Design a protein around this ligand. Sequence first.
Ligand SMILES: [Ca+2]
Ligand SMILES: [Ca+2]
Lengths: 72, 158
Amino acid sequence: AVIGDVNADGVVNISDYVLMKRYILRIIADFPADDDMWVGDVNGDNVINDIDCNYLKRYLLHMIREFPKNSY
Amino acid sequence: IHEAETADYILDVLVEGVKAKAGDTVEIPLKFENVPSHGIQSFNLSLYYDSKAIEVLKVEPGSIITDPANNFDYNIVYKDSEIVFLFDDDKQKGEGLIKTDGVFAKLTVRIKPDIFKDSGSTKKYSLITFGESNFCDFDLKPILAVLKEGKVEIEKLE
Ligand SMILES: [Ca+2]
Ligand SMILES: [Ca+2]
């Protein structure tokens, strides 16, 4: 599944960013996607937290083209 | 590509035209009109400019942006001559949604003084175009954005 794609809709966009923020705030208890750590830990430090949220921000601002963690 | 989509809500995004002279530094306002009153939670929007004619020196949030220090970011992708905006009501409690029409950002740009080099015209136009555009409400429902491109009309100096 797609890294950063926390609602499992195939793409990484603002909805994933808003969901990540709400998830870290515990405004939601969990992501719609299955494997939280696979989709949400985008830098691959085996933690989901504001660092991941910031990577999503960087991605959406086109500061980076992909996340540090990869499928390969 | 701005994807053709269908949704329950819509707004208009406009580049407000400016008339300037080669060499000027000017502000280009970017506006939202017909903002849904129930509010925008987040948006991500790209613009492109022609780096042969325009240099972007600053990007600032507009008056309709709530808590911009926390809610508003931009990035200029210099290699692509692209300006990317990201807005999100960061605290996620529905209290900083954008519900009002007006200026969402202002670009400060310099019009290159040498744009008429090797040209016999006294008037040129430079287009400001859009890329991807994504908006949603508090419930993550999409809000469509009708994008209207803009132009800088540029007069030769002297
Ligand atoms: Ca997604
Ligand atoms: Ca992480």
